[PDB]
Design a protein around this ligand. Structure first.
Ligand SMILES: N=NNCCOCCOc1ccc(-c2cn(C[C@@H]3NC[C@@H](O)[C@H]3O)nn2)cc1
Ligand SMILES: N=NNCCOCCOc1ccc(-c2cn(C[C@@H]3NC[C@@H](O)[C@H]3O)nn2)cc1
Ligand SMILES: N=NNCCOCCOc1ccc(-c2cn(C[C@@H]3NC[C@@H](O)[C@H]3O)nn2)cc1
Ligand SMILES: N=NNCCOCCOc1ccc(-c2cn(C[C@@H]3NC[C@@H](O)[C@H]3O)nn2)cc1
Lengths: 448, 448, 448, 448
């Protein structure tokens, strides 16, 4: 019915993370992460799943890259397992660790696929967690050394860099709500972890600059969009809190040199303060070349005093949901892209977008029509924003592979390629071939 | 997992129209309407369907009323076949015609079901169409005689009245786009039909008072909602035209004594003018007690000069659609009700809301889950508006029965009760038992 | 391949309750009960189900009695809707109420079906709940007036009487755990309700004699069985608490004139005391002719301080469960009957035993093999106890009809006759024809 | 719902036996067994199945061991084909025989899998049976030489040893009931075979000690658990006979230096006596390091004079049964583990536990949910006993592979891995992957 044509140099991609796909959790001197520890704790991850084996992409990456070439993709976003480089986070490197990632990146560049490297996708070496992890400013220097080691080792091989993936998850999901590793439930710790994350980000971009490292560097928050149930100022405040804690809390420091004051005030009445030290805000405000945004769903919220620490309750409006329960409402991606212009018409990459659809292989194919539907509606919104003049530069599907989906284990499938975890067999889904058509054509035609 | 509770006085109902359900088109001296003529012309209605038999509700109204009694609804919205009362539309009444609506209306009242009487649901007697139909002010007086006769015979039996159902369909779809009877394609004619419709409404309302007829009176427009694809003024203009022709074009005269000037300007540059005669604007501005709103779908539009006489192109956003092709996006219902607050916090009834879901009887049941899905999402928006303080007084599902869906014939099913047109067997759908629960409880719970 | 033959005098029956099946909740001057109020409150009953219509056994009792006649059962256990007799619970009787139970009871007797009359199956008139309900000794006198009126009008027509059905549910599930009407969560209140229940039982029994009313009278507790996970004294203590609150708490006063002291001690350390007034313990100890026992499931428990007010955690042993989640382990029925020999070899009827098996009608049949499986295993335990010399006199399957299963609504089917709640059509399940054979033959044969 | 966590050094395993899996029945000089002879007799084994080919594990063991490594198992229990070592049972060894088992054990140790070696799993060389088999004390010395040859040949390669598997089967099933090879029906012969088995066990442990052989050594009885139908002393005696003949008959000699006197008395009235010679009881009482117990089912028994030579009749209580007809009641494993403390808190391995579930491969997988269910309930009971302080040290699933299931042939499948006997293809069942999770995690979570 309608054709949606994309910019000539638009960057089409797919995305993974190291712990979700790699496996080989004890191989080549790799040290333990806080997620190994968390997944090896009963009751923390559904069905007692863990990432020991996952997709075995530590051994099978060549097959995965061949599939990405046939997909016609232009970029591949991946993360580096910190404990594969610094098993303890303390200076003594593991060359085997570095050697793995060199084989990966060389195959990517030899196939015409630009690496998009996420440094921190949640696998803090357990060694550093023992000392307090991100709640301890000592981890700041350990990360800066980790980033520096990568900036040095892959200079000229990698042109796109991200420091941290989804700071709201690392800070508040992990240390306020206890849902992800390390599993704490204390607001003050969550705020501490966020701040030390912003400082470690600042210091790593600085090093990037001073090292003259090739390419550009930014950060990749997951973005919330909530819309008020009523016209009340209370419901509007509740949505502002939900929205701002995901994005503004981390971006207003980076771009505007301050935390969102209304959230500062809110936490202060809960007895928490940001542990800002002298020079910190100056470190966080180091200029970045772009940001990545991660989008999945949006909500209709109202104010409720009993609804968690943000007193923001989500309403079930009856919309259809993915197989993980998130409602499909693609307009939120357009709204939030316009919302973020408050930081300017900055370069924006869509670093994650996808749907949980748990169809498996029947008669040799995975008929994940609901995933094509999801992608169609949301790719319409990307084109829509680009047309409004926003500098949206790329789009990465979450995910290339079905993988270990954190506290849900393997029960929640996000890939455009099916993985049978008993055999490690890869089966491109129907969304894979549909996506191959869109990226190969560089235009979308909405149908069905 | 959210509870939505409705006001104690909330009016739950169901809606039909005479030609869509009644049948008996040559029975008891009923004369031909423009829809008999249109449906008897090859090429006009899908598959050559017509309303000669329909649901045979001329004979089976007792079963239909038994089913709505077991449904627990408090109101039943129906329309009167004009050529059953005045077969030629020129004075000699058909007591047989009046007799039918008396057994229906009395049977409703005896069951505690409030009649909600639509006088004009598109079945204009062919005799008046020969004289030019609505383009000829002579039928204005013919309609006023019809309404008086109905107020006269049914005083105290009907407490809720509507003059016209969906004026934009009567005028522009029928006489500009040629899709509905009488099927002309002339801009100026469409504007004439619209104006004389409003004059007949004003005069019938001005007479309603003068007779002291029981109850309240209003009009039931179908309501459009469009949102711009881009931020441009042209796209916002294109959406304003789409929205305003459905509602503003008719409601601004009634409430504010003027036509939307920006559309007047639009048509005058196409060679069309409104034939206002002295006293007309004052006849139209006769105060009404409430309005009905008919909502199905909403759209994302852009400005396009090649896109019809409103130059407003609606974009396929990839959203899921019903079995007739209309996307499901319930927030437009919340949006348009707030839009309509420009006319004051007037009493508003949702006289139509529904979905084409073409599921048939399998193992004795109609598993129309997509209709339950649609109805729940839109009933959430009704509660949301009432909660915002808007005077939303009732809700009528379109439709009680699968019926003759105009140019689509019987191929497009909207009912909550399935009708097998080969046997006339009624089978309540799963949506029926779902609705029975909501109306009996007077609160909704989001699920699935 | 084993034959189990039952005594010649063995009483085979079926069991229902008034609110679960009757419907006609506003018909013939029936007043509101606490379950009407509870089921009409959002959030209390799954899906917002209620008993307004239920199985419509207020009107369809003749069909239900025809089906139990063809079943060949010798007794039918039913309960009396108190607010059908005394709508406000304060003296002015409703002859219409009494009339209904007279046509039922006479129709049963005419068919050779012995009425087994439960006076209280949880439908306390709302008027008394406004005054505090069972926590207020004033309703004690209100109940005694109810029972006398029933002994009075139904002398010689009913030869089997039960005062209360499942006292632990009436007291602790309803007023400590808040799961059943009236839904409070107060320890002290629950103990008050329990004590005043026993006083009303004693007085109604003491009056039973004094009126020389025909037949025998007892009480029908639901019975718990728990076995310790470990050999520890704490685990055995935790199981003793679980077991004793269901049965001992009520049966030790009636038979041995004292409350279980170890639970008295338990509650007194939580701040709760039994409100015994002079003469109370002697009123309760009124001799009764037999008891009813209600058995469904048994458990493996351990001591856990965080595990509710009894600090007894039941362990998921991995056993298969019914469609409501209760594990099937029939030996607890044999176990608890032997346990109850501490009160002498008293006459015991199994007034309830059944399974939630949610199979529906497929090709005209309900292939509820898991219900046949459950019933056979438990009827083996009945024969085993009789063979051990215990005075087990009868067995009533819960339930005759799929009905309103309290906080689960209609989603949890226990019937041996399927009821389609959209049509009220009765379809006897395969368990029905299976039961017809066992009761007609008066012996069981193990198979499958 | 509940997590069951196991001891850190708990030994997870799987189990096989030589004749059930090996095949190559005439290869490399292997001599005939009493089971070859029995399976080659018409009417003895269902469908005329035999073990000539079986699973061909004589040739395919490398595939089976690779599958066991991926399973994450810590031990593998297997048996040695006596006629592969001593084709005639008389001194002249077959080095080829020894060579096969050396290739097996070396692959096991190289993969980190500890061998658990059963010396006698029923394949008595037919040569020795011709001379009377176990009914002849000459076989005692032939076995001691066989065991000595293995103790010598695999010293330092094998650390866990069992002399005999299921003496009740070798003695009473084979020589009293005629169900297994050699198929005799004479009580006196059965008693003779049992006694010569106990002496050959004693002499082999002694040799083990005197040889200083590596590791520990014990015996692996199959254990009965019967529970009385009634409270009668007769039913309790009948259960004691059933229970004691399986375990006490062999363990009371080994631990307490005497046969169970009440069974001695019982057989004496049937004209049978134990052929005890001077020094025999002293040989049998040689100390052992541990025992293995084999558990599958439990029964409810009563006394019946016509019910076999133990006058102990099993009652069909209506419980669900595996596909071989044995009821699933996991509590018997806990009861019998406590029962055996009468011999002290000895080290106990669960050397066989499994279910007959005959699901085959459908759409590439074997959906043996009933096997996962069975294992879940019984693994709960192992944890339960460990928690009571019993020295339960390991658990071995029966079986790794579908195999030749004695008189039932191949029609009764026990494996966690499917074997197609027409192709020899191995397919891990769903229980395989479920078991992999449990052993890899070392905890169980009960679900479904
Ligand atoms: N009672 N209240 N407290 C607890 C209430 O539940 C709280 C659970 O919250 C959440 C919220 C959000 C997520 C989540 C997962 N992704 C997708 C991953 N993206 C990064 C990549 O690696 C993907 O795998 N995005 N968001 C999970 C859980
Ligand atoms: N060239 N391209 N072709 C497509 C050209 O279509 C242009 C638009 O056509 C239309 C537009 C709108 C309708 C319509 C039907 N209802 C539902 C009824 N409501 C009144 C009641 O009686 C119900 O039965 N509401 N609106 C039908 C046709
Ligand atoms: N927080 N966790 N949530 C779970 C909290 O549940 C706690 C326990 O709830 C219960 C416990 C027991 C029952 C119950 C139902 N019957 C069957 C009926 N017998 C009387 C007859 O009328 C039948 O209809 N017997 N017992 C219901 C609910
Ligand atoms: N009329 N009366 N007489 C005859 C009545 O039937 C008697 C039949 O008895 C039995 C009793 C028990 C078994 C049996 C098989 N396993 C399983 C194997 N375990 C060792 C391993 O190798 C497995 O393959 N355990 N027990 C077979 C038959």
């Amino acid at each position: 019915m309608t054709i949606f044509q994309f910019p000539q140099d638009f960057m089409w991609g797919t995305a993974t993370a190291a712990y979700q796909i790699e496996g080989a959790y004890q191989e080549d001197g790799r040290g333990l992460s806080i997620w190994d520890t968390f997944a090896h704790t009963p009751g923390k991850v559904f069905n007692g799943d863990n990432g020991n084996v996952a997709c075995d992409s530590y051994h099978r990456y060549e097959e995965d890259i061949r599939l990405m070439k046939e997909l016609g993709i232009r970029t591949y976003r991946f993360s580096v397992s910190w404990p594969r480089i610094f098993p303890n986070g303390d200076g003594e490197v593991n060359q085997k660790g570095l050697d793995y990632y060199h084989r990966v990146v060389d195959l990517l560049n030899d196939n015409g696929i630009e690496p998009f490297c996420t440094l921190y996708h949640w696998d803090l070496p357990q060694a550093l967690q023992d000392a307090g992890g991100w709640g301890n400013r000592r981890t700041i220097q350990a990360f800066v050394q980790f980033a520096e080691t990568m900036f040095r080792e892959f200079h000229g091989k990698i042109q796109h860099w991200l420091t941290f993936n989804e700071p709201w998850c690392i800070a508040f999901l992990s240390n306020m709500l206890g849902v992800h590793a390390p599993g704490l439930t204390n607001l003050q710790t969550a705020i501490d972890v966020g701040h030390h994350l912003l400082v470690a980000h600042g210091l790593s971009v600085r090093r990037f600059r001073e090292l003259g490292t090739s390419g550009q560097i930014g950060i990749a928050p997951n973005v919330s969009w909530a819309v008020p149930y009523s016209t009340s100022e209370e419901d509007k405040a509740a949505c502002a809190r939900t929205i701002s804690l995901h994005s503004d809390w981390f971006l207003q420091p980076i771009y505007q040199g301050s935390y969102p004051q209304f959230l500062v005030d809110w936490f202060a009445e809960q007895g928490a303060t940001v542990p800002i030290q002298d020079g910190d805000m100056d470190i966080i405000g180091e200029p970045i070349d772009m940001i990545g945004i991660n989008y999945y769903s949006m909500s209709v919220n109202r104010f409720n005093p009993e609804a968690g620490f943000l007193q923001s309750e989500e309403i079930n409006m009856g919309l259809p949901v993915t197989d993980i329960g998130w409602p499909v409402e693609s307009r939120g991606l357009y709204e939030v892209l316009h919302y973020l212009q408050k930081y300017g018409n900055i370069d924006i990459y869509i670093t994650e977008n996808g749907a949980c659809i748990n169809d498996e292989v029947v008669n040799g194919k995975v008929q994940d029509d609901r995933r094509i539907s999801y992608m169609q509606q949301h790719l319409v919104q990307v084109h829509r924003a680009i047309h409004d003049g926003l500098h949206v530069k790329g789009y990465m599907a979450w995910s290339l592979l079905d993988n270990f989906e954190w506290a849900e284990g393997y029960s929640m499938r996000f890939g455009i390629i099916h993985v049978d975890f008993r055999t490690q067999v890869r089966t491109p889904k129907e969304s894979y071939y549909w996506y191959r058509k869109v990226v190969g054509n560089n235009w979308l035609e909405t149908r069905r």
